[PDB]
Design an enzyme around this catalytic site. Structure first.
Site, PDB file in Angstrom:
ATOM      1  N   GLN B  39       0.822  -1.210   0.000  1.00 52.08           N
ATOM      2  CA  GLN B  39       0.000   0.000   0.000  1.00 52.08           C
ATOM      3  C   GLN B  39       0.861   1.268   0.000  1.00 52.08           C
ATOM      4  OE1 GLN B  39      -2.067   2.417   3.624  1.00 52.08           O
ATOM      5  NE2 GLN B  39      -3.093   0.538   2.973  1.00 52.08           N
ATOM      6  N   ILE B  40       0.364   2.327  -0.639  1.00 57.81           N
ATOM      7  CA  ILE B  40       1.128   3.564  -0.829  1.00 57.81           C
ATOM      8  C   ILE B  40       0.546   4.785  -0.123  1.00 57.81           C
ATOM      9  CG2 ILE B  40       1.510   5.380  -2.483  1.00 57.81           C
ATOM     10  CD1 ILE B  40       2.383   3.126  -4.440  1.00 57.81           C
ATOM     11  N   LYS B  43       0.607  11.264   2.470  1.00 60.23           N
ATOM     12  CA  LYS B  43      -0.312  12.243   3.039  1.00 60.23           C
ATOM     13  C   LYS B  43       0.270  13.659   2.985  1.00 60.23           C
ATOM     14  N   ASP B  72      -6.720   7.290   0.982  1.00 60.97           N
ATOM     15  CA  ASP B  72      -7.460   8.547   0.966  1.00 60.97           C
ATOM     16  C   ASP B  72      -7.641   9.059  -0.458  1.00 60.97           C
ATOM     17  OD1 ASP B  72      -8.843  10.721   1.910  1.00 60.97           O
ATOM     18  OD2 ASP B  72      -7.055  11.868   2.466  1.00 60.97           O
ATOM     19  N   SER B 195       7.692   1.096   9.595  1.00 55.27           N
ATOM     20  CA  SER B 195       9.021   1.552   9.984  1.00 55.27           C
ATOM     21  C   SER B 195      10.054   0.446   9.885  1.00 55.27           C
ATOM     22  CB  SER B 195       8.990   2.110  11.410  1.00 55.27           C
ATOM     23  OG  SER B 195       7.892   1.584  12.136  1.00 55.27           O
ATOM     24  N   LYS B 352      -3.956 -14.235  37.702  1.00 52.16           N
ATOM     25  CA  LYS B 352      -4.655 -14.693  38.905  1.00 52.16           C
ATOM     26  C   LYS B 352      -5.518 -13.590  39.522  1.00 52.16           C
ATOM     27  CE  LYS B 352      -4.124 -13.644  42.857  1.00 52.16           C
ATOM     28  NZ  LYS B 352      -5.537 -13.800  43.312  1.00 52.16           N
ATOM     29  N   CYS B 437      -2.299 -12.286  46.749  1.00 54.96           N
ATOM     30  CA  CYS B 437      -0.915 -11.967  46.395  1.00 54.96           C
ATOM     31  C   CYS B 437      -0.024 -13.156  46.732  1.00 54.96           C
ATOM     32  CB  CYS B 437      -0.408 -10.738  47.163  1.00 54.96           C
ATOM     33  SG  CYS B 437      -1.321  -9.175  46.945  1.00 54.96           S
TER      34      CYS B 437
HETATM   35  N1  LIG Z   1     -14.855 -18.035  51.570  1.00 54.63           N
HETATM   36  C1  LIG Z   1     -13.674 -18.839  51.241  1.00 54.63           C
HETATM   37  N2  LIG Z   1     -13.730 -20.180  51.394  1.00 54.63           N
HETATM   38  C2  LIG Z   1     -12.628 -20.952  51.095  1.00 54.63           C
HETATM   39  N3  LIG Z   1     -11.449 -20.355  50.634  1.00 54.63           N
HETATM   40  C3  LIG Z   1     -11.382 -19.008  50.473  1.00 54.63           C
HETATM   41  C4  LIG Z   1     -12.485 -18.235  50.773  1.00 54.63           C
HETATM   42  N4  LIG Z   1     -12.142 -16.885  50.524  1.00 54.63           N
HETATM   43  C5  LIG Z   1     -10.789 -16.853  50.059  1.00 54.63           C
HETATM   44  N5  LIG Z   1     -10.302 -18.129  50.015  1.00 54.63           N
HETATM   45  C6  LIG Z   1      -8.920 -18.573  49.620  1.00 54.63           C
HETATM   46  O1  LIG Z   1      -7.909 -17.518  49.799  1.00 54.63           O
HETATM   47  C7  LIG Z   1      -7.186 -17.278  48.522  1.00 54.63           C
HETATM   48  C8  LIG Z   1      -7.561 -15.939  47.877  1.00 54.63           C
HETATM   49  O2  LIG Z   1      -8.907 -15.589  48.156  1.00 54.63           O
HETATM   50  P1  LIG Z   1      -9.531 -14.148  47.620  1.00 54.63           P
HETATM   51  O3  LIG Z   1      -9.466 -14.148  46.158  1.00 54.63           O
HETATM   52  O4  LIG Z   1     -11.068 -13.864  48.166  1.00 54.63           O
HETATM   53  O5  LIG Z   1      -8.499 -12.990  48.206  1.00 54.63           O
HETATM   54  P2  LIG Z   1      -8.073 -11.630  47.342  1.00 54.63           P
HETATM   55  O6  LIG Z   1      -7.943 -11.866  45.901  1.00 54.63           O
HETATM   56  O7  LIG Z   1      -9.200 -10.477  47.667  1.00 54.63           O
HETATM   57  C9  LIG Z   1      -6.397 -11.227  48.079  1.00 54.63           C
HETATM   58  P3  LIG Z   1      -5.819  -9.477  48.331  1.00 54.63           P
HETATM   59  O8  LIG Z   1      -6.023  -9.159  49.758  1.00 54.63           O
HETATM   60  O9  LIG Z   1      -4.232  -9.405  47.894  1.00 54.63           O
HETATM   61  O10 LIG Z   1      -6.639  -8.471  47.313  1.00 54.63           O
HETATM   62  C10 LIG Z   1      -7.478 -18.518  47.681  1.00 54.63           C
HETATM   63  O11 LIG Z   1      -6.418 -19.420  47.485  1.00 54.63           O
HETATM   64  C11 LIG Z   1      -8.813 -19.043  48.179  1.00 54.63           C
HETATM   65  O12 LIG Z   1      -9.107 -20.392  47.923  1.00 54.63           O
HETATM   66  C1  LIG Z   2      -5.602  -3.574  50.812  1.00 54.65           C
HETATM   67  C2  LIG Z   2      -4.550  -2.897  49.920  1.00 54.65           C
HETATM   68  N1  LIG Z   2      -4.646  -1.480  49.527  1.00 54.65           N
HETATM   69  C3  LIG Z   2      -3.727  -1.079  48.571  1.00 54.65           C
HETATM   70  S1  LIG Z   2      -2.666  -2.423  48.128  1.00 54.65           S
HETATM   71  C4  LIG Z   2      -3.509  -3.474  49.234  1.00 54.65           C
HETATM   72  C5  LIG Z   2      -2.887  -4.856  49.328  1.00 54.65           C
HETATM   73  C6  LIG Z   2      -3.464  -5.880  48.319  1.00 54.65           C
HETATM   74  O1  LIG Z   2      -3.433  -7.146  48.984  1.00 54.65           O
HETATM   75 MG   LIG Z   3      -5.718 -10.308  45.004  1.00 47.98          MG
END
Ligand SMILES: Nc1ncnc2c1ncn2[C@@H]1O[C@H](COP(=O)(O)OP(=O)(O)CP(=O)(O)O)[C@@H](O)[C@H]1O
Ligand SMILES: Cc1ncsc1CCO
Ligand SMILES: [Mg+2]
Ligand SMILES: Nc1ncnc2c1ncn2[C@@H]1O[C@H](COP(=O)(O)OP(=O)(O)CP(=O)(O)O)[C@@H](O)[C@H]1O
Ligand SMILES: Nc1ncnc2c1ncn2[C@@H]1O[C@H](COP(=O)(O)OP(=O)(O)CP(=O)(O)O)[C@@H](O)[C@H]1O
Ligand SMILES: Cc1ncsc1CCO
Ligand SMILES: Cc1ncsc1CCO
Ligand SMILES: [Mg+2]
Ligand SMILES: [Mg+2]
Lengths: 510, 511, 510
Positions: B39-40, B43, B72, B195, B352, B437
């Protein structure tokens, strides 16, 4: 549809969206000047906002019976069913464009030089059904004419012409006026404004204004009678030109080189009229205001092209300039400097010798008659060609112009040209500022004329009184040096005695 | 002339004269490049030099049997018997153009939103016979799928596609690979490069290298077994997984918010691997070079997108694995951006998130979280984990496979392997901070351990057990929140060193 | 004439000609806000254009019964018979000025510090018949009060006061509110606006607006009941505060240093409410928007004073902040950083230990009761002083303010202060983020309150639940390390069981 032939190019409004006064649409402007043809130029936007603006305006226009024309695009219009398109020289080839839009659509072309009209014509009709001539001011009129001429020479009758680039009320009349063919048969078919209706705070008004100028017929550029005189100048007449200019005491402002400075200063108040060598830009409007002022314009002078333009205009703005191009055809630099001054204003008289008067006619003896006649007409002036015979052609045509009907066939061949001689007087060629000084003289005559005066005779008057006082000095002298002082005398005397029945020179017909 | 059905969009070169290497022409570059589709774009130039330029090249192309397309400038196109014309969302309406050019000739259209594919289709065949998908990078792949989808939700089977904008060798496979319809039936028909062939001091060789990527079919983005596993993870396997990560002692770098800083530090060296908490840019290239390095990526953290892209790229340059924890996908305008932005910096080995976050990423109950997990893990070609009472673990990598416009042999977002890991109510798990986490730190450690012959899926599924396992224990052995955390870390520390998965609490079902 | 005593400083419009919106005069503005006192400042023009503008306006004003006051000049006014003059600290001495203008003319003075009110008073009445207090924002309220106080201490009753510099609708209520004397007897007599009525496109409106705020009486700065409670907190009540905050799940955003980061994060979702440590400026408005959000503010933190101001405001704009200044009185730098945050917004609660709580009161045991009571009142907040005895004073006065009538004599001596103890527990001083964490707790209580809730109890609630869970951990532990983990437990448990009749701490009266 529109027929090519219903296209009236009177006042051709080409847009440039990006320069609209605030609190004002483009539709808002284009409407105003429609109530007093139209092309669209949008070399920047999105080809969709283009198509919307264009349709919005194509309808405004058809409500006024006026057609619409587009720019660099050959897609758009087609897509919006437009009346024509206007392409530049670096846009699309004129054959390709016709192969798409086919017959029936007005095709504009931008032509600056004539090798282009030779092309334009090597295509016949139905291709380029008009052109916008060069870019007058940022080539000017002089170039407009080289073109209007390659048209005739090629009998290209299908193609119309619109003048474009720089046009304003402070110069429109002049463009329309001196932009006539060399044969006088074809003038400009219309004017293109832009920054004049578009960028205006009240485009209702300005469009009226540019209409006033366009379909008027009368460029009175100087407050002196322009009537075409066929009858040689009469003694009683030369007599009264002098009586006038003496009774008048014209203030003749001299912009001129340095050699002619003192000489011409005397040659002036010898003709019993006051002289002013001022090259100061702030004065030009104060002087040109003075009861009988008159401008002598010399080339080479130490003054800048800014202040020369300032004056050529300062006078034209009040209506009479005498212009001496020396050389004007010697060096590259002089060549320019003149041609450039020659687009600044409208001159009452251009006085030059046989080299200068050929150079201006665009390059012997019958020749010099053919030549002065060109230069007189081409620049809509009384041209004077100094020699053994001074020739005096009149090309002003009474101040008349028209749209595209030219001048009622009044060519560069058939204007009033004459001849003033008193035989061999070599020793006038051997004094300095001699031609520059015929200028100071011609100039004093013209200045002393009243409204009801006549411009042709006032020049033809000047050229006698000078050739006359020149025969005398040549007799009463021992060489050059004294020649000058006896010439200034012969003028001081010739005039106060004011008895033309005496004067040496014979006035023939060319 | 060409038949619409003869346009091979494979490598699609779109020009831009004003960027040519000195001592080189355009013809000069566009000739090395025809050694498909061209394509050419001008502009700026003079419509007349344009036309001369367009002709010089139309021949060059026709000589290698490849067609040419303008831009165009529809007139220029017509004027010179151009093969197609490509216009933009703010250039001339498609109708108008078809009114002038009439059928037989190809019409490109710059699309970026789905609202535009809808318009595209409400016009039907013979109009827009292909599109160029948005500007990927200066929106990204995420929003290339949004369109690839509308296209399939509108059976516009005539309309072909090409990806355009930012496409270079450091991101072409990723783009070809994760830019497939949601039903895995339609992928990109070809790439647009600018590019990268033009401004090349050796277009000859740059064109070869772009071929290399474009019709290859294997994006090995991480140095781990990506095979589609269908049988449940076995105890022998979760055991070896652990035995591997213990014996290899992975380096897990942690870009993560401030609370999870110390927690997951321990959860990491408690999994028998060492943890780095570096948000230093100069370093990334040095760390991701360590023999078992792994990157855990939290959001909200204090580091600048600059370093995050610095890091994501780092690990991808070396085929080491990345774990991604997007905090609140819709939490707040600001986070929404941040994340959708990082998600275009590289190719993730695992994403996750909790229910909200995984509904955020799937793009808005219980059966629903399975559907959604399968989506997020397919969309972004990754193993994705939704945590809750049940943790769901879909695999979306399709073994690193991609193709051109054949998409993926009908393997949708619906029929990838998704599993589940429950061990009953343990409410007390979300009542401790950094729990999600920390499931990451674990998933991060298990993938770290994996060797070439390894397998990415089972390795995620491993860590999700080990976690939910140590979850059950800590709960039973505590008396509050504070105590829960210290029992968790400990449960992990013990669980692994004994490595007897026969024991573990959590039941591994199918979705 | 005007009597000093007819001078109503409600809304005092001081001009700055050079900042008028186009297509609008100064007369045009000053008229608008007159229909909804006025001084003229022209430190630049010609003292003649000054005198013309001044007369032109002195007449507009007297048509509305309002007086006129001039700036740096003691010639002008005199010459134009003006009602008063207002001089800065570097202008002319206050004795000299009275010697010319003599008794009968209102004399304004700019006072920023108190050594100046000591001077102001060493002159008696008939000199300085009012003052414009410092430059609040470009010292703030805190300094406004050091002044309003040197007034009382000097029984300067003749002199009135107008707050000046930085005043806007997005902070007026607060200035008027916490700018009450220490004895509560004297508040601000009025506000000075400039860039608010003058630079406004519709000064009719804005003047109405600033009127709405000025003579209202009700600063509802937080969507929680502010009523003054005299009755100790009851078990049934603490019980329901918890039941609320659990049913509510307040999102508590933690801007805080790094040690308290994890700890307080748990201490939060242990109290069964979600926490957010975000120090990102673009979010502050998204978070504060969330159904029950609540802001924990720690000092020292790695965050810039820009984003702290962004948040203090982001919440105040939606109505509850808990502020922990640590240290806030250690280093020069901390000293500043706090005082600066303390002028950004209005805080629901300021929690500090015995050094911090004395530092704020502007430098034992009865002392600490006198002190918490000051800080509670001074910053119109529930102040908490952590020690062996946690004291909890309430200085919000239900959100009431008035012009220059202060608060109906409700000094810094007689506000509701209490005491929560459970004897010697040294081992709470030997864990980190302990006070920072009483913050996370207090904070969760306040967040869970609904409109009809009460702010005092929610704090007094928090301080129990914490002192309570603190006695437990101290018993069930082996040292520090375990102390922390058993404290987080004792909270997680204490709350889900929710049976306050149990809890260790005794609640006395100060
Ligand atoms: N009501 C429940 N029954 C069984 N397991 C639970 C549960 N609530 C949380 N978990 C367990 O804890 C872990 C994470 O759970 P969840 O996803 O609710 O935390 P989160 O993602 O809000 C962590 P953060 O505090 O970093 O935001 C998993 O491995 C999960 O199986
Ligand atoms: C609750 C919270 N607020 C900012 S970061 C953090 C940690 C995520 O586990
Ligand atoms: Mg989390
Ligand atoms: N051989 C001749 N016979 C009669 N008159 C002559 C003549 N040569 C010059 N003249 C006269 O002198 C005038 C100007 O002289 P010329 O023809 O050389 O122009 P020029 O531009 O060269 C003058 P300068 O010296 O200022 O450059 C004429 O108007 C003419 O009347
Ligand atoms: N000797 C003591 N007896 C009973 N309680 C005590 C105590 N010393 C501290 N506390 C408790 O612990 C809390 C805070 O401890 P402290 O008075 O040292 O403030 P602080 O700003 O120093 C905490 P940090 O360590 O975060 O800087 C109080 O609210 C109080 O309930
Ligand atoms: C007439 C003239 N014009 C400008 S200077 C000058 C000379 C003054 O004697
Ligand atoms: C684990 C870690 N990451 C960066 S510094 C650091 C502290 C060394 O214990
Ligand atoms: Mg000459
Ligand atoms: Mg503290």
């Amino acid at each position: 549809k529109f027929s090519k032939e219903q296209f009236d190019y009177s006042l051709y409004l080409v847009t440039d969206s990006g320069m609209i006064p605030e609190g004002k649409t483009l539709y808002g402007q284009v409407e105003a000047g429609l109530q007093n043809l139209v092309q669209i130029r949008e070399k920047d936007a999105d080809t969709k906002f283009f198509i919307e603006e264009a349709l919005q305006i194509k309808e405004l226009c058809h409500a006024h019976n006026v057609p619409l024309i587009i720019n660099d695009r050959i897609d758009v219009a087609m897509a919006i069913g437009a009346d024509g398109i206007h392409v530049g020289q670096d846009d699309m080839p004129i054959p390709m464009i016709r192969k798409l839009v086919g017959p029936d659509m007005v095709i504009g072309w931008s032509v600056g030089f004539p090798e282009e009209v030779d092309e334009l014509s090597k295509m016949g009709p139905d291709m380029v059904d008009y052109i916008g001539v060069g870019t007058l001011f940022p080539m000017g009129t002089a170039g407009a004419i080289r073109v209007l001429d390659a048209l005739e020479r090629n009998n290209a009758h299908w193609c119309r012409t619109v003048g474009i680039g720089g046009l304003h009320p402070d110069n429109i009349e002049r463009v329309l006026y001196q932009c006539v063919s060399s044969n006088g048969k074809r003038s400009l078919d219309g004017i293109c404004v832009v920054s004049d209706i578009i960028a205006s705070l009240d485009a209702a008004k300005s469009t009226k204004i540019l209409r006033g100028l366009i379909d008027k017929t009368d460029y009175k550029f100087v407050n002196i009678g322009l009537s075409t005189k066929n009858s040689l100048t009469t003694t009683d007449e030369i007599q009264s030109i002098i009586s006038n200019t003496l009774k008048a005491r014209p203030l003749v402002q001299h912009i001129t080189n340095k050699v002619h400075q003192n000489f011409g200063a005397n040659v002036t108040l010898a003709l019993g009229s006051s002289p002013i060598m001022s090259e100061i830009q702030s004065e030009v409007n104060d002087l040109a205001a003075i009861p009988h002022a008159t401008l002598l314009l010399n080339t080479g002078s130490v003054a800048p092209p800014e202040m020369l333009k300032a004056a050529i205009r300062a006078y034209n703005d009040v209506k009479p300039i005498v212009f001496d191009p020396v050389g004007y055809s010697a060096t590259e630099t002089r060549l320019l400097l003149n041609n450039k001054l020659l687009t600044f204003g409208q001159f009452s008289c251009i006085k030059g010798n046989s080299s200068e008067i050929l150079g201006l006619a665009e390059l012997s003896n019958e020749l010099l008659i053919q030549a002065t006649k060109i230069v007189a007409f081409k620049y809509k002036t009384v041209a004077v060609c100094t020699g053994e015979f001074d020739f005096i052609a009149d090309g002003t045509i009474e101040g008349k112009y028209s749209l595209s009907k030219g001048t009622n066939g009044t060519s560069v061949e058939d204007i009033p040209c004459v001849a003033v001689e008193a035989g061999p007087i070599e020793i006038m060629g051997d004094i300095t500022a001699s031609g520059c000084s015929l200028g100071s003289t011609i100039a004093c005559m013209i200045g002393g004329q009243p409204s009801e005066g006549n411009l042709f005779h006032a020049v033809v008057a000047g050229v006698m009184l000078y050739k006359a006082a020149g025969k005398i000095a040549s007799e009463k002298c021992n060489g050059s040096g004294s020649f000058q002082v006896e010439l200034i005398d012969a003028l001081y005397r010739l005039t106060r005695e004011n008895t033309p029945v005496t004067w040496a020179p014979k006035l023939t017909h060319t």
